[PDB]
DNA sequence: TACTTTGATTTTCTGCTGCAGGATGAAATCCCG
DNA sequence: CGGGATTTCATCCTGCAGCATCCCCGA
RNA sequence: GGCGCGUUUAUUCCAUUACUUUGGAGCCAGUCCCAGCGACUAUGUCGUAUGGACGAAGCGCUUAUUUAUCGGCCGAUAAGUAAAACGCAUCAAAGUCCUGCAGCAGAAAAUCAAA
């Protein structure tokens, strides 16, 4: 039976546990606040429940609304002030937000600059550069660059990033002292958020400490993006000037009137970017009108300019959810998660937020087993690792409190609240922080979008598994296709197939197919879509997201099934070394057909939450795996058409060509998607070649300049090459016949085994002297695979 | 002097994904009763 | 003499190799 | 296209806690109440859906309440019929969030050029 939780239980039961590092895996719970609509929904069931919870009181709702409005206004005001400050002088803010080194890097500085990279704007003094060289754990030498000022107050070690001329490299949200400037009343800054916006009603500590992060994170992100994008602008300008010089020279060579417009110097604001893009667009329009259109010049010989893209805008000011933030869960920030003991295995959950002046949420430590009825309890986590159970007492009718009852399901509760293993009572799970989200949700009863209150609570796992004993031996190759989502094959370390799966007939085998019946489903959906489109020119809202939802369902289920098979079979998964975002980008393609990276990421995240690295069960490997027969190892190539076009000599019966000593009969018909006609036109290959040969003598290939060679190659690129049937596969050596997907799945695992063989090592050693080639790789492939077929990989007869 | 595709400027709308900042308590001083 | 409420502060390492794996077409 | 019931995703144990989705199953998709096309003399349709306006949306079983029907409610079945409770249709999976930026697309509209 296939459940992810059963797999997780199997993993936990099969391995030991250890304490997590400095920061462990983190997971988030998103639930909803018990509102009156949920109360009515619970009251309208056929079988009414015995005890319906009370909804959130009016006072809590009013206080929450007031707090949300004030928080949003404060964030806007601070962001506006820092936007103005950045506009006045970018360099000052850039140096101020720079994240200093930890106050423990006290290794003896050895070498200064061989100096004016930046400057400490606090004292307006140059920030002299100092060097520090060290060697990492793997032996690669690394040089650390630091900036130090002569001022005792500014005796810091700001990080610097060398460039081939220096950059900062880091922008932290705590580098700038936000609290002492805008929060405390001792400062004389003209802009004070809490004193002016909140009307002296909000507690300084928690609200200020929340605003600090809420603003500095955005400012740091914006500054990092700005700093990164400036260098790419320099590179683009450098690569663009030469190209425009070449284009101007070409235009002068044709004797046309080139416009007298010159590039502006590199800008640093959005208006300069706009002007530069306008000039580039004008130049490209002129080039299009004069060179490619009238004279028909190719793109490579006359290539356009490139626009300036990626310049960021200041957060939230250079122009909806309302967010109330909680910095942390400790007695200092005036927030708590309270649960009522009734029995040694039951809880009753609430969450209290006291952000107002004139509230009472006093704690007091209790004995480990001093629990009493009608009294609330909670736990507090320390840096030292100790857990102190403390009880919370307060007044339910407090006019300054915020009381939130939560609503969730059994799955979420078993995952976080009352989990069997990760029980937060003993400290195995720690509550990190939380948020309050106010967003619009669809109400089906009223058929309107209405505001709803959500609660997000992030939990950090403190005990993880030990990967020192997870050593899979067997292998599983996954071959993906469009007709079938996935076909897999199970092999032992030696590579021999393992007959442990069961087919429909129950016979032993080593092949399974996952997610079948898909193709007819999306084809029915597309048939309905096309019928509606032909009927009325458009489809209803139903067919907007059916394919996407079904594809997401299928990829999730396939990932779950392969995870189950790998875990229960003691095998390590192998995927194809496809670059991220790989897929077919054509005419009738859909974005719902790209589930390679999505699957890898889902599997990686699921393995990561348990504390194991991806290399324990998940891997990648290599190119030329689907085009290889399992009898001798012959492989066809797209570049192998050069062999076809090498002779192309003519006989009395027509054209003839040979590849690898095998005669090829030149005949066949070609049907291609003619975009000029938006239809399919069928042409005869021999007839096309004869029409080409009408204007040629002796039909010699070497007499071809550029064009007729390309047209003949495009004609010949179908012929008799590798594919009588798309799904069926036949081997050229002895006529071996087998399904293509199964062979591809087996060959992917065998390729992964190959990339760690000794032939590959000697290949790389020859690469050390320099042997970058293409034919040698395929030759080693064929030789190794033939040897392995000879020794251990007995073929099926 | 019939009536397709391509390359291109701008205008709007619907979506969908990548990538930075993240996931804070310990302790030292005022104010006060 | 506690008991809150407000202010300062400081916490982090170095990933290998294929010509294309659905991207090459005639005009 | 819409309208509602909801079960399973922990092994003897841990909230039919109730949230957000996916898949399956269940029911209604009609009314002439109007304006279209065949061709039109071009603010006026004989047959025909190109659009508009209203309405629609489980079945059983156990418990009083208006009549028929004869023995003078002791006779049950038909509707209106309160609430409790059960059964069937009807069954299985998943969830890591916030902020700010940009980048990818898809579809329409105003202008230059071509065999």
Cβ proximity of A569 and A490 under 8 Å: yes
Cβ proximity of A577 and A536 under 8 Å: no
Cβ proximity of A440 and A3 under 8 Å: no
Straight-line distance from CA A253 to C1' D4, in Å? Answer: 77
CA distances from A341 to A53, A350, A365, A370 (A): 17, 12, 16, 11
CA distances from A452 to A52, A408, A665 (A): 20, 15, 71
* Contacting residues 748-787/A vs strand C (CB within 7 A): 755, 760, 763-764, 774, 777-778
What burial class does residue A506 get, using C-beta atoms within 10 Å of its C-beta: 0-12 exposed, 13-18 middle, 19+ buried? exposed
Cβ proximity of A104 and A111 under 8 Å: no
The whole-angstrom separation of Cα A319 and Cα A311 is 15
The whole-angstrom separation of Cα A420 and Cα A665 is 70
Tokens of A472: 């899979």
CA distances from A702 to A76, A513, A697 (A): 72, 50, 12
The whole-angstrom separation of Cα A233 and Cα A277 is 12
What burial class does residue A559 get, using C-beta atoms within 10 Å of its C-beta: 0-12 exposed, 13-18 middle, 19+ buried? buried
The whole-angstrom separation of Cα A424 and Cα A746 is 46
* Contacting residues 46-105/A vs strand B (CB within 7 A): 99
List A547's β-bridge partners, or say none. none
Chain-centre distance for alpha carbon A90: 31
* Contacting residues 592-621/A vs strand B (CB within 7 A): 597
CA distances from A537 to A531, A544, A590 (A): 9, 14, 19
Residue with tokens 């980008």: A585
Task: Mention every residue, 6+ apart, whose C-beta is less than 8 A from residue A157.
Answer: A100, A101, A105, A146, A147, A148
Nearest residue by alpha-carbon distance to C1' of C6? A205
Straight-line distance from CA A522 to C1' D26, in Å? Answer: 25
Tokens of A785: 């695979």
Count of H-run helices and E-run strands, chain A = 18, 33
The whole-angstrom separation of Cα A662 and Cα A720 is 12
Element (H, E) at A134: strand A125-135
The whole-angstrom separation of Cα A472 and Cα A80 is 56
Cβ proximity of A745 and A488 under 8 Å: yes
Query: Residue A485's closest CA among A453, A521, A449, A513?
Result: A513
Strand pairing class (A620-621; A486-491): unpaired
Nucleotide nearest to A557 (CA to C1'): D93
Residue with tokens 């490619």: A292
Tokens of A259: 């416009």
Element (H, E) at A283: helix A270-287
Task: Mention every residue, 6+ apart, whose C-beta is less than 8 A from residue A598.
Answer: A555
Q: How big is chain A, counted in residues? A: 797
Backbone angles phi, psi at A495, to 5 degrees: 105, -10
Chain-centre distance for alpha carbon A118: 34
Nucleotides on chain C that have an atom closer than 7 A to a protein CB are 3-15, 17-27
SS3 A185: coil
* Contacting residues 250-279/A vs strand B (CB within 7 A): 277-278
Element (H, E) at A330: none
The CA angle A662-A759-A491, to the nearest 5 degrees, is 85
CA distances from A566 to A472, A561, A563 (A): 9, 9, 5
Domains plus CATH for chain A?
A: 27-37+321-465 (no CATH), 65-227 (no CATH), 468-621 (3.30.420), 641-791 (no CATH)
Straight-line distance from CA A711 to C1' B6, in Å? Answer: 20
Cβ proximity of A115 and A128 under 8 Å: yes
The whole-angstrom separation of Cα A391 and Cα A379 is 8
Tokens of A58: 């009016």
Straight-line distance from CA A44 to C1' D66, in Å? Answer: 32
Tally the C-alpha atoms within 13 A of residue A527's C-alpha that lie toward its C-beta.
6
Straight-line distance from CA A144 to C1' C14, in Å? Answer: 13
Nearest residue by alpha-carbon distance to C1' of B4? A676
SS3 A145: strand
Query: Residue A786's closest CA among A756, A761, A754?
Result: A754
Task: Mention every residue, 6+ apart, whose C-beta is less than 8 A from residue A387.
Answer: A379, A380, A381, A425, A426, A427
Straight-line distance from CA A477 to C1' D92, in Å? Answer: 29
Nucleotide nearest to A75 (CA to C1'): D99
Among positive and negative, which fits the CA dihedral A601, A604, A605, A606?
positive
The whole-angstrom separation of Cα A406 and Cα A454 is 9
Q: DSSP E strands: which ranges in A506-653?
A: 508-509, 511-514, 571-576, 620-621, 650-651
Tokens of A133: 């060289």
The method of structure determination was: cryo-EM
Nucleotide nearest to A173 (CA to C1'): B21
Straight-line distance from CA A529 to C1' D90, in Å? Answer: 29
The whole-angstrom separation of Cα A275 and Cα A281 is 10
Straight-line distance from CA A690 to C1' D38, in Å? Answer: 53
Nearest residue by alpha-carbon distance to C1' of D51? A536
The whole-angstrom separation of Cα A118 and Cα A357 is 44
Nucleotide nearest to A330 (CA to C1'): B25
Query: Residue A236's closest CA among A311, A169, A160, A314?
Result: A311
Q: After which residues does chain A show a gap where C to N exceeds 2.5 Å?
A: 114, 164, 319, 622
SS3 A127: strand
Whether the beta carbon of A445 falls within 7 A of nucleic chain B: the reply is: no
SS3 A162: strand
Tokens of A175: 């580098």
Straight-line distance from CA A180 to C1' B27, in Å? Answer: 17
The whole-angstrom separation of Cα A335 and Cα A324 is 13
Nucleotide nearest to A430 (CA to C1'): B23
Tokens of A356: 């107002």
Cβ proximity of A795 and A631 under 8 Å: yes
Q: DSSP for A380-411? A: EE-TTS-EEEEEE---TT-TT-EEE-EE--HH
Directed axis angle between helix A546-569 and helix A597-609, to 10°? 50
Backbone angles phi, psi at A603, to 5 degrees: -65, -40
Cβ proximity of A120 and A151 under 8 Å: yes
Whether the beta carbon of A119 falls within 7 A of nucleic chain C: the reply is: no
Residue with tokens 């460039």: A163
């Amino acid at each position: 039976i296939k459940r992810i939780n059963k797999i997780r239980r199997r993993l936990v039961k099969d391995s030991n546990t250890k304490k997590a590092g400095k920061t462990g895996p983190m997971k988030t719970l998103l639930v909803r606040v018990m509102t009156p609509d949920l109360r009515e929904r619970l009251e309208n069931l056929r079988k009414k429940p015995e005890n319906i919870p009370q909804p959130i009181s009016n006072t809590s709702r009013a206080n929450l609304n007031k707090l949300l409005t004030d928080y949003t206004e404060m964030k806007k005001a601070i962001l506006h002030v820092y936007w103005e400050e950045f506009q006045k002088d970018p360099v000052g803010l850039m140096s101020r937000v720079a994240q200093p080194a930890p106050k423990n890097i006290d290794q003896r500085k050895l070498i200064p600059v061989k100096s004016s990279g930046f400057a400490c704007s606090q004292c307006c003094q140059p920030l002299y550069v100092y060097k520090l060289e060290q060697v990492n754990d793997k032996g690669k030498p690394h040089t650390n660059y630091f900036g130090r000022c002569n001022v005792s107050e500014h005796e810091r070690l700001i990080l610097l990033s060398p460039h081939k001329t220096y950059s900062l490299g880091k922008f932290g949200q705590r580098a700038l002292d936000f609290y002492s400037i805008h929060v405390t009343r001792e400062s004389n800054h003209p802009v004070k958020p809490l004193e002016q916006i909140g009307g002296n009603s909000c507690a300084s500590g928690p609200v200020g400490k929340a605003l600090s992060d809420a603003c500095m994170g955005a400012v740091a992100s914006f500054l990092t993006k700005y700093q990164d994008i400036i260098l790419e602008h320099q590179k683009v300008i450098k690569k663009n000037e030469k190209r425009l010089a070449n284009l101007k020279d070409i235009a002068s060579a044709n004797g046309l009137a080139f416009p007298k417009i010159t590039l502006p110097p590199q800008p640093h604001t959005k208006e300069g970017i706009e002007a530069y893009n306008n000039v580039v667009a004008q130049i490209v329009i002129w080039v299009n009108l004069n060179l490619w259109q009238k004279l028909k010049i190719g793109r490579d010989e006359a290539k356009p300019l490139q626009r300036l893209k990626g310049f960021p805008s200041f957060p939230l000011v250079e122009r909806e959810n309302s967010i109330l933030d909680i910095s942390g869960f400790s007695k200092q920030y005036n927030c708590a998660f309270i649960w009522q003991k009734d029995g040694v295995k039951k809880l009753n959950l609430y969450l209290i937020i006291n952000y107002f002046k004139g509230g009472k949420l006093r704690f007091k430590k209790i004995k480990p087993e001093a629990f009493e009825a009608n009294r609330f309890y909670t736990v507090i986590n320390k840096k030292s690792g100790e857990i102190v159970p403390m009880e919370v007492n307060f007044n339910f009718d407090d006019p300054n409190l915020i009381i939130l009852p939560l609503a969730f399901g059994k799955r979420q509760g078993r995952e976080f609240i009352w989990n069997d293993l990760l029980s937060l009572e003993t400290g195995s799970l720690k509550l990190a922080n939380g948020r309050v989200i106010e967003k619009t949700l669809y109400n089906r009863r009223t058929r309107q979008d209405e505001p709803a209150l959500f609660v997000a609570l992030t939990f950090e796992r403190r005990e993880v598994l030990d990967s020192s004993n997870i050593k899979p031996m067997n292998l599983i190759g996954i071959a993906r296709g469009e007709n079938i989502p996935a076909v897999i094959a199970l092999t032992d370390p030696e590579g021999c197939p393992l007959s442990r799966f069961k087919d429909s007939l129950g016979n032993p085998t080593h092949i399974l197919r996952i997610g079948e019946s898909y193709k007819e489903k999306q084809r029915t959906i597309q048939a309905a879509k096309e019928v509606e489109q032909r009927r009325a020119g458009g489809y209803s809202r139903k067919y907007a997201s059916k394919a996407k939802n079904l594809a997401d369902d299928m990829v999730r289920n396939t990932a779950r099934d392969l995870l189950y098979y790998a875990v229960t079979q003691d095998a390590m998964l192998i995927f194809a070394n496809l670059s991220r975002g790989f897929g077919r980008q054509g005419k009738r393609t859909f974005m719902a057909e790209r589930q390679y990276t999505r699957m890898e990421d889902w599997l990686t995240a699921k393995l990561a939450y348990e504390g194991l690295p991806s290399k324990t069960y998940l891997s990648k490997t290599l190119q030329y795996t689907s085009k290889t027969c399992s009898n001798c190892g012959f492989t066809i190539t797209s570049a192998d058409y050069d062999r076809v076009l090498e002779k192309l000599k003519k006989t009395a019966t027509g054209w003839m060509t040979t590849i690898n000593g095998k005669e090829l009969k030149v005949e066949g018909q070609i049907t291609y998607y003619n975009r000029y006609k938006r239809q399919n036109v069928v042409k005869d290959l021999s007839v096309e070649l004869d029409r080409l040969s009408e204007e040629s003598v002796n039909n010699d290939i070497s007499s071809w300049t550029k064009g007729r060679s390309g047209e003949a190659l495009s004609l010949l690129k179908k012929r008799f090459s590798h594919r009588p049937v798309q799904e069926k596969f036949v081997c050229l050596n002895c006529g071996f016949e087998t399904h293509a997907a199964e062979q591809a799945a087996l060959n992917i695992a065998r390729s992964w085994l190959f990339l760690r063989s000794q032939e590959y090592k000697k290949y790389q050693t020859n690469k050390t002297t320099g042997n970058t080639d293409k034919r040698a790789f395929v030759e080693t492939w064929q030789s190794f695979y033939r040897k392995k077929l000879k020794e251990v990989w007995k073929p099926a007869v």
